[PDB]
Coordinates of N, CA, C and O and ligand atoms in Angstrom, one line a residue:
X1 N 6.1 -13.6 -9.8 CA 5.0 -12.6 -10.0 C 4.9 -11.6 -8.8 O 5.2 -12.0 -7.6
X2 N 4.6 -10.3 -9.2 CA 4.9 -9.6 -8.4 C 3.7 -9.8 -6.7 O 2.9 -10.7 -6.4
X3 N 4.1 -8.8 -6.1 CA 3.0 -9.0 -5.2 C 2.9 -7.8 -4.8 O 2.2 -7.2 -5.5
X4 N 3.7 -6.6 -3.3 CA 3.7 -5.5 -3.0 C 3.1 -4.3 -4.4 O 2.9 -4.4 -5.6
X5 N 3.0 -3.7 -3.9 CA 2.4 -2.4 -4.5 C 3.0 -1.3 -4.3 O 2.8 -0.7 -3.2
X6 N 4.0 -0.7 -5.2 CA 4.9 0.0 -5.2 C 5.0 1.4 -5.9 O 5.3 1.4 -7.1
X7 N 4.9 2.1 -5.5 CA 3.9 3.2 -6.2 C 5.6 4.4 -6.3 O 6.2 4.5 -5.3
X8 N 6.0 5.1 -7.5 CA 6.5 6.1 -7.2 C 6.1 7.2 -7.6 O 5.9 7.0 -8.8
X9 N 5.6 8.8 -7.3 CA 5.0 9.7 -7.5 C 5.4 11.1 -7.6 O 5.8 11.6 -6.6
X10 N 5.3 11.8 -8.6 CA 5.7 13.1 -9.1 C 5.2 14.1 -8.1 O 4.0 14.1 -8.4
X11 N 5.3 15.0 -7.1 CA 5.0 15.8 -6.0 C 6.3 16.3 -6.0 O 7.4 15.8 -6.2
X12 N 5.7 18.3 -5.5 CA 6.5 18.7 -4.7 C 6.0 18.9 -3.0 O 6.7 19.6 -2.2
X13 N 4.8 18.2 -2.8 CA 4.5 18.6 -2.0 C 5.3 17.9 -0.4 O 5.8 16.7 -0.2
X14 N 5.4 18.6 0.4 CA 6.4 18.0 1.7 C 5.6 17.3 2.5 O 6.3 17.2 3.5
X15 N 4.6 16.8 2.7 CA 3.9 15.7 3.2 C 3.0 15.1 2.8 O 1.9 15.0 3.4
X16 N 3.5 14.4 1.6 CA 2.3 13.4 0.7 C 1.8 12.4 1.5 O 2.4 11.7 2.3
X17 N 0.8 12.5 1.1 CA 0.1 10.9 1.7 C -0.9 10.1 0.6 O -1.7 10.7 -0.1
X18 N -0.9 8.8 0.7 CA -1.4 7.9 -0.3 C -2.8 7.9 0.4 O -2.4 7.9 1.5
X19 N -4.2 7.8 0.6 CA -5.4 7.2 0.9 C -6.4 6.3 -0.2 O -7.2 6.9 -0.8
X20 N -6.2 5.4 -0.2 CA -6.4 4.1 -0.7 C -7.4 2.8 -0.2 O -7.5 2.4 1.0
X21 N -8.1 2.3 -1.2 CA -8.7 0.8 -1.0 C -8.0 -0.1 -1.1 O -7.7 -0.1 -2.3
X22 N -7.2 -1.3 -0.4 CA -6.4 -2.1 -1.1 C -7.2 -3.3 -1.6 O -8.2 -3.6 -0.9
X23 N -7.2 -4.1 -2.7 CA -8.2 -5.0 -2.9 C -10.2 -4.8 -2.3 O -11.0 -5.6 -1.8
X24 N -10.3 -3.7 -2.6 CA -11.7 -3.1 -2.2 C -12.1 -3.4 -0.7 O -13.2 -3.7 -0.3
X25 N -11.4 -3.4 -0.3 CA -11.4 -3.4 1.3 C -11.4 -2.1 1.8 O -11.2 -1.2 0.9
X26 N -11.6 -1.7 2.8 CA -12.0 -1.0 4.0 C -11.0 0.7 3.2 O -10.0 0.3 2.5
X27 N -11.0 1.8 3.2 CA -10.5 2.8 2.7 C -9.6 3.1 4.2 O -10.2 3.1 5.2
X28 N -8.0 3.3 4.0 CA -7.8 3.9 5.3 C -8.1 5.0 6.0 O -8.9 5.9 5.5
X29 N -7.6 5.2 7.0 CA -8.3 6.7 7.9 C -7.3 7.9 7.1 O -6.1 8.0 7.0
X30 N -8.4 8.5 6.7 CA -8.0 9.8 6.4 C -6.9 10.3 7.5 O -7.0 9.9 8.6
X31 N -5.8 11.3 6.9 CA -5.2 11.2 5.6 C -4.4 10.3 4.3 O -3.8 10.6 3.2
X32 N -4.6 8.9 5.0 CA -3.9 7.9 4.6 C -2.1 7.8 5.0 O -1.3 8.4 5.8
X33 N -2.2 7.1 4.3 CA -0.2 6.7 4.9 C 0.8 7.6 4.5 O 0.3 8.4 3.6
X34 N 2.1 7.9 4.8 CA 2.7 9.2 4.2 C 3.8 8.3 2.8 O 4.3 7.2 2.9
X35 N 3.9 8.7 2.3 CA 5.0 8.4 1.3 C 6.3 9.3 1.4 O 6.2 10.5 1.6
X36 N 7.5 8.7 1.2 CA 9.1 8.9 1.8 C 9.6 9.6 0.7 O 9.1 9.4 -0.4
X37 N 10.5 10.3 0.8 CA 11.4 10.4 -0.4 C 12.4 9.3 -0.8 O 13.1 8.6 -0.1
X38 N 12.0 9.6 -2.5 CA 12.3 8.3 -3.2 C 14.0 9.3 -3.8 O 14.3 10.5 -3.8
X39 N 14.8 7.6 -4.5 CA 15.9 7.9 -4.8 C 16.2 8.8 -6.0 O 17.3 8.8 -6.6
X40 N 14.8 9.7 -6.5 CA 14.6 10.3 -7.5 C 13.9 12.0 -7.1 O 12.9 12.4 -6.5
X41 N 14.9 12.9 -7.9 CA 14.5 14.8 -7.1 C 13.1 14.1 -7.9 O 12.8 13.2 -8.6
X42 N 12.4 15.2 -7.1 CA 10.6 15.6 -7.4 C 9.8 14.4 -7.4 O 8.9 14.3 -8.2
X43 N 10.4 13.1 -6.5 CA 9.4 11.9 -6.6 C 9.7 11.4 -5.3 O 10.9 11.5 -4.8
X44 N 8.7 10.9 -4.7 CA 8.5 10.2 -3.5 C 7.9 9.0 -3.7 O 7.0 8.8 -4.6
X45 N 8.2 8.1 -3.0 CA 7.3 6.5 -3.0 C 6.9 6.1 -2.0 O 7.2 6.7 -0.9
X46 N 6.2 5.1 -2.1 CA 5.7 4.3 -1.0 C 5.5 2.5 -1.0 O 5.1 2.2 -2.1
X47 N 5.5 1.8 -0.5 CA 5.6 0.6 -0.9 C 3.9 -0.4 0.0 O 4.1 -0.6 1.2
X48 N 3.1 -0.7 -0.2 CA 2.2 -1.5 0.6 C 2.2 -2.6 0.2 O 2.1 -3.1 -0.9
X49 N 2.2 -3.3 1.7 CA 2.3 -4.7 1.5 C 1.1 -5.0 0.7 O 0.0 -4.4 0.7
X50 N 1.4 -6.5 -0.2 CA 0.1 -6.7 -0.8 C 0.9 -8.1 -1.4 O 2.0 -8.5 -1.6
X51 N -0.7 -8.6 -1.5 CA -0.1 -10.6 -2.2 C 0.0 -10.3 -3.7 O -0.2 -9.2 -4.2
X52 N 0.3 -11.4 -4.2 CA 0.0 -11.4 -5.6 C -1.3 -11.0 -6.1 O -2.3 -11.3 -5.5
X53 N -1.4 -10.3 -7.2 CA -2.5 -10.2 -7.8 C -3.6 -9.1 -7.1 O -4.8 -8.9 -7.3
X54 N -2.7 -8.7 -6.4 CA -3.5 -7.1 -6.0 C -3.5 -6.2 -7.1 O -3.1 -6.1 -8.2
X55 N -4.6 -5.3 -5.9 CA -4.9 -4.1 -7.2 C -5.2 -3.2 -6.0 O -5.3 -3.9 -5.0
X56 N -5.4 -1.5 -5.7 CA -5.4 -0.9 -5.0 C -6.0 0.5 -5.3 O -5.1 1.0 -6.1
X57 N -7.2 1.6 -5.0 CA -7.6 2.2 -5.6 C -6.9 3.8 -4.6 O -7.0 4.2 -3.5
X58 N -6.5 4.1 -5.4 CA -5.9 5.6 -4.5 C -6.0 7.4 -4.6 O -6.0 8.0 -5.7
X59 N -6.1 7.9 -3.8 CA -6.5 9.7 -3.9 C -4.9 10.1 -3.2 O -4.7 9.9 -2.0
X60 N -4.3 10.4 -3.7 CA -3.2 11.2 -3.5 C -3.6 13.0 -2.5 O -4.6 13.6 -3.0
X61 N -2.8 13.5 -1.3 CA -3.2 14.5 -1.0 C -1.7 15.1 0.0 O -0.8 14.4 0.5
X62 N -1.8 16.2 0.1 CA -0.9 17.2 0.6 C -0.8 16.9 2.0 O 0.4 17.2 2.3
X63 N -1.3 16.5 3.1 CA -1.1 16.1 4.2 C -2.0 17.3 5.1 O -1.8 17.5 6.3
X64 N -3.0 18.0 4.3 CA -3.7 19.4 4.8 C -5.0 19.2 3.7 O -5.8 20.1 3.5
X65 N -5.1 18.5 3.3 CA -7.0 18.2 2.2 C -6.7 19.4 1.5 O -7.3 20.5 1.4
X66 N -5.3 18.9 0.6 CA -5.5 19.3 -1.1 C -4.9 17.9 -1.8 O -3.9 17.3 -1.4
X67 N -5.7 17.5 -2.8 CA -6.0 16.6 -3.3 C -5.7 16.1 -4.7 O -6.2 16.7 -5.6
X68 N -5.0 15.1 -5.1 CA -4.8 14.7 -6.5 C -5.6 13.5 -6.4 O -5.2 12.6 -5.6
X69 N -6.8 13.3 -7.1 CA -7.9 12.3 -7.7 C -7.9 11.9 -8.9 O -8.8 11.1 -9.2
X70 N -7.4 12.1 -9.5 CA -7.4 11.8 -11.1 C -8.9 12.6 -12.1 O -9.3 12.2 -13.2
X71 N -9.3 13.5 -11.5 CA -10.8 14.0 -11.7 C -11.7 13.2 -11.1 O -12.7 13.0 -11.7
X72 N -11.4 12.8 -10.1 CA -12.7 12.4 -8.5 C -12.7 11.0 -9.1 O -13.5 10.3 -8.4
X73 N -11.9 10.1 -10.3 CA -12.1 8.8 -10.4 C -11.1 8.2 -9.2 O -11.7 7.4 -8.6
X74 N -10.3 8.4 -8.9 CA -9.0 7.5 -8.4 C -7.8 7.1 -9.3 O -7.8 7.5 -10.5
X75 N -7.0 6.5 -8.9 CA -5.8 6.3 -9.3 C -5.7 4.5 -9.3 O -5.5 4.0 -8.2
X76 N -5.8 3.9 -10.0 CA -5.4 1.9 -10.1 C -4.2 1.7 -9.9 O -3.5 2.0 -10.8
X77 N -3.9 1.3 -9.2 CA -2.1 0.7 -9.2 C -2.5 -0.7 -8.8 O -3.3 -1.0 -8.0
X78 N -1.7 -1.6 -9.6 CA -1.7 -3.2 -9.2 C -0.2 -3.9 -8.7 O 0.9 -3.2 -8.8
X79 N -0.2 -5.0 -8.3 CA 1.4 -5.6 -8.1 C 2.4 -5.1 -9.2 O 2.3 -4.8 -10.4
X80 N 3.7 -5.2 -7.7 CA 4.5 -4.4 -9.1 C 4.5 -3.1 -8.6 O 4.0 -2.5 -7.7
X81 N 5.6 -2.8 -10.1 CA 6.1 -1.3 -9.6 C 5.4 -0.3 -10.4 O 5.3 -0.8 -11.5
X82 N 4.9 0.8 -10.4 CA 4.6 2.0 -11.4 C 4.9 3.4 -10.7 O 5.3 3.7 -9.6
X83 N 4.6 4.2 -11.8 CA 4.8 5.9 -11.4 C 4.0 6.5 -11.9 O 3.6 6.5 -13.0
X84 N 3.5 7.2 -10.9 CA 2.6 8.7 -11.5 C 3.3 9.7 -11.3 O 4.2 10.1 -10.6
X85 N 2.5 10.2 -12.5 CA 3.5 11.7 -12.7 C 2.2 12.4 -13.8 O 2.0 11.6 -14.7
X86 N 1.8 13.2 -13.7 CA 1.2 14.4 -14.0 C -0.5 13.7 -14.3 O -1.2 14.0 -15.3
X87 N -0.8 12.9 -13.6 CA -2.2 11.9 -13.6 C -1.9 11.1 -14.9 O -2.7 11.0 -15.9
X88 N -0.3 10.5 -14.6 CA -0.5 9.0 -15.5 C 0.3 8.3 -15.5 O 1.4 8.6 -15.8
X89 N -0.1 6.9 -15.2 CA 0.7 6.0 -14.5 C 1.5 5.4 -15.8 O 1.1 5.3 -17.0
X90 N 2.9 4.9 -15.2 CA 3.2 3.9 -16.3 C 4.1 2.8 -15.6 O 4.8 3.2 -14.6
X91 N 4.1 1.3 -15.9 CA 4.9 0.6 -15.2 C 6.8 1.1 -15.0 O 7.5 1.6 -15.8
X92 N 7.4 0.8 -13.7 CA 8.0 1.1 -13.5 C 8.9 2.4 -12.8 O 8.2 3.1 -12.1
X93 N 10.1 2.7 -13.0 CA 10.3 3.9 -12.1 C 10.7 5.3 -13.2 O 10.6 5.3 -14.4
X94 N 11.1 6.3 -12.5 CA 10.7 7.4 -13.1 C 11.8 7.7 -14.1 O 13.0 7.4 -14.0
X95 N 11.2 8.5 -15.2 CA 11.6 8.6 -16.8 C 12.2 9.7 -17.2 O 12.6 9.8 -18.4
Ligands
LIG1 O1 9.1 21.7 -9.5 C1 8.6 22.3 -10.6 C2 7.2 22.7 -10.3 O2 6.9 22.9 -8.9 C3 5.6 23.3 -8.6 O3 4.7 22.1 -8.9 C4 4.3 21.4 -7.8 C5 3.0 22.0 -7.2 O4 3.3 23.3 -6.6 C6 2.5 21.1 -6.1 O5 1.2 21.7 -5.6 C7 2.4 19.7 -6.5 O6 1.4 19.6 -7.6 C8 0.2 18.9 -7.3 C9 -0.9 19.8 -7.8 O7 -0.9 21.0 -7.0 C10 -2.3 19.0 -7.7 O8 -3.3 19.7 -8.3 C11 -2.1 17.7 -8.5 O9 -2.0 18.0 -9.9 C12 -2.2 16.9 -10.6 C13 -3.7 16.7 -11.0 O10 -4.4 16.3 -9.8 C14 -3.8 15.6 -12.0 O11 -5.2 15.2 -12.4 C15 -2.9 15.8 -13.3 O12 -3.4 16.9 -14.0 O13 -1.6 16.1 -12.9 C16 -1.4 17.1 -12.0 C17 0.0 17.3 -11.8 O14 0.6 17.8 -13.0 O15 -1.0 16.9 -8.0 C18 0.2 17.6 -8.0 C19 1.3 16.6 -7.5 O16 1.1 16.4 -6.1 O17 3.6 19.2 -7.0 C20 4.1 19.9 -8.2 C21 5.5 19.3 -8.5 O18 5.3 17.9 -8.8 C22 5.1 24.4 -9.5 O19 3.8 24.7 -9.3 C23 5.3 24.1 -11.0 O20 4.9 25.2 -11.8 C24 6.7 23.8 -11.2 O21 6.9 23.4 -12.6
LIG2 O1 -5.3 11.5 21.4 C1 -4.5 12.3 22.3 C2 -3.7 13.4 21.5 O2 -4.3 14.6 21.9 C3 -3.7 15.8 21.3 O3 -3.8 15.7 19.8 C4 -4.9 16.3 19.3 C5 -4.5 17.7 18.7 O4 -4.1 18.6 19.7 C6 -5.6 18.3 17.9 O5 -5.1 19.5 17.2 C7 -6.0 17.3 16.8 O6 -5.0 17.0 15.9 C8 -5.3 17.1 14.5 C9 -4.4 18.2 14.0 O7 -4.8 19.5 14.4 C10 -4.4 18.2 12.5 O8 -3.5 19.2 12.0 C11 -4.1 16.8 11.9 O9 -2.8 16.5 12.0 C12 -2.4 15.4 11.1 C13 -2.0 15.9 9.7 O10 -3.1 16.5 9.0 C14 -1.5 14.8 8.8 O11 -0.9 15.3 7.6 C15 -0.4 14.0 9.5 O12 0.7 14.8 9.7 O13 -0.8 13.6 10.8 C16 -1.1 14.7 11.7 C17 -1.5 14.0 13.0 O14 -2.5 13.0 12.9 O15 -4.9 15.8 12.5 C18 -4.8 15.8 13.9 C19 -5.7 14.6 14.3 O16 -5.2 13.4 13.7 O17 -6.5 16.1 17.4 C20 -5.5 15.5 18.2 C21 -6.1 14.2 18.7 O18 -6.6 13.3 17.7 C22 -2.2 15.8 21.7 O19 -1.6 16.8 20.9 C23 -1.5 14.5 21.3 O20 -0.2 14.4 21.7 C24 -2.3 13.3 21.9 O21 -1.7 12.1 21.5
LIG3 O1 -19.3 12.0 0.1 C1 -19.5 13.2 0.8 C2 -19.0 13.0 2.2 O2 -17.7 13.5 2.3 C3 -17.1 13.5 3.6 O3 -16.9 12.2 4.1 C4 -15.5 11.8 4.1 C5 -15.1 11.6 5.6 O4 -15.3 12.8 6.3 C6 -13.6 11.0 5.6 O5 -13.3 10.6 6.9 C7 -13.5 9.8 4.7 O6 -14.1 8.7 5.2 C8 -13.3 7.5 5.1 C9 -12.5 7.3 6.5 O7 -11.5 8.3 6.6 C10 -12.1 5.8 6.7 O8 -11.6 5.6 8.1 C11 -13.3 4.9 6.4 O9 -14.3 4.7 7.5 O10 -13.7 5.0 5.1 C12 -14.3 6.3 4.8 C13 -14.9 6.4 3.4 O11 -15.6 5.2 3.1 O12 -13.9 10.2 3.3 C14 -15.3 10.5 3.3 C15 -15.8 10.5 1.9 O13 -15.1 11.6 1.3 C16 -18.1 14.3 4.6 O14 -17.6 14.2 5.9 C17 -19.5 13.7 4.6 O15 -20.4 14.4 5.4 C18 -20.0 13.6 3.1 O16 -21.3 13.0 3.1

């Protein structure tokens, strides 16, 4: 069963960063963590440590406060792998 939280993400932006709850804990410090380029054009990932049975609530942002929120709810990603891409997640990597 999975555990990490593995996010891969549709951006062209050149310094994404993930800002996130992980299991409703503590939000990190703005701007959150950066996300790398992934083995896929126009997608970058990130990977956060996490146990089994996580879940993780996230605001995607430009690395300058412009913002992908999903319309101010957040973004859910759980253990395991998924992708966003145009505000919608689906298990696994990019399609
Ligand atoms: O590569 C082809 C495309 O390149 C350009 O698209 C870029 C944008 O310029 C970037 O700004 C970024 O897009 C952001 C977007 O700016 C931001 O609003 C956000 O959009 C989300 C939205 O929050 C969400 O609710 C849902 O509607 O999906 C949107 C994305 O469709 O997040 C974006 C991703 O960070 O990156 C894209 C490339 O991925 C160019 O403008 C396009 O016309 C061109 O096709
Ligand atoms: O603490 C000692 C440090 O002092 C000096 O750093 C200062 C800067 O000179 C200030 O400009 C400011 O830095 C801001 C910065 O202006 C801003 O753009 C932003 O930079 C972020 C960025 O948005 C984000 O996308 C990612 O790239 O990280 C960047 C760096 O964090 O935020 C900065 C603050 O975090 O404040 C700092 C001190 O906090 C000196 O230059 C440093 O060498 C020294 O360590
Ligand atoms: O809700 C309106 C609120 O928005 C602004 O507050 C934001 C902070 O400025 C920003 O730092 C961030 O706060 C988080 C920290 O970065 C993190 O270290 C930690 O302590 O969790 C914080 C969130 O719980 O986000 C907030 C909310 O957007 C603005 O500054 C406020 O005046 C305003 O009331």
């Amino acid at each position: 069963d999975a555990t990490d939280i593995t996010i891969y993400y549709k951006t062209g932006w050149t310094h994404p960063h993930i800002h996130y709850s992980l299991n409703q804990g503590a939000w990190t410090t703005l701007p959150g963590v950066p996300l790398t380029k992934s083995e896929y054009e126009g997608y970058v990932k990130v990977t956060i440590e996490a146990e089994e049975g996580s879940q993780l609530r996230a605001a995607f942002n430009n690395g300058s406060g412009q913002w992908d929120n999903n319309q101010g709810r957040d973004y859910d990603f759980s253990s395991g792998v998924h992708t966003l891409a145009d505000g919608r997640i689906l298990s696994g990597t990019p399609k």
